[PDB]
Amino acid sequence: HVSVKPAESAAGSWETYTMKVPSEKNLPTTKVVLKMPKDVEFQQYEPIPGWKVSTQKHDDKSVSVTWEATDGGIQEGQFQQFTFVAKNPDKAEEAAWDAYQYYKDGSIVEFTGDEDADTPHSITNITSA
Numbered sequence: 001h002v003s004v005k006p007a008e009s010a011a012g013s014w015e016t017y018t019m020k021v022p023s024e025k026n027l028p029t030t031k032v033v034l035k036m037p038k039d040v041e042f043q044q045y046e047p048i049p050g051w052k053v054s055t056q057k058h059d060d061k062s063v064s065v066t067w068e069a070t071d072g073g074i075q076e077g078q079f080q081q082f083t084f085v086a087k088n089p090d091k092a093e094e095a096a097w098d099a100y101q102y103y104k105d106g107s108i109v110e111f112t113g114d115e116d117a118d119t120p121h122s123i124t125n126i127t128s129a
């Protein structure tokens with residue numbers, strides 16, 4: 001389960017988010033893609049050794065951030081944390097973090113489900129502020 005913390009944050013602020021990516025298969029995780037929630041504006045990322053980071057804007061003006069491994073990736077028994085800054089929406093809402101975790105066999109785990117789903121996305125509760 002890919003979790004973006006803090007799981008609660010104030011509307012209208014810049015927040016320092018940390019995405020934690022645990023290994024869930026005995027296979028290297030080689031890439032992670034995080035869709036920015038609607039109304040969350042990505043600002044900057046923090047460099048991590050062994051990873052190259054890039055942003056991509058799509059037709060619907062949605063933004064995804066990609067961390068790609070350059071030196072083995074996340075191996076069995078490991079997790080890695082990826083920190084970035086984003087501007088929160090200006091109203092209270094549920095910001096859902098759709099994450100895509102790429103393993104070395106070419107498989108992809110889509111953490112995009114709801115509460116009851118097998119691969120759920122994590123959520124930041126954006127509160128009034």
Ligand SMILES: [Cu+2]
Nearest residue numbers: 001002003022
């Ligand atoms: Cu989890």
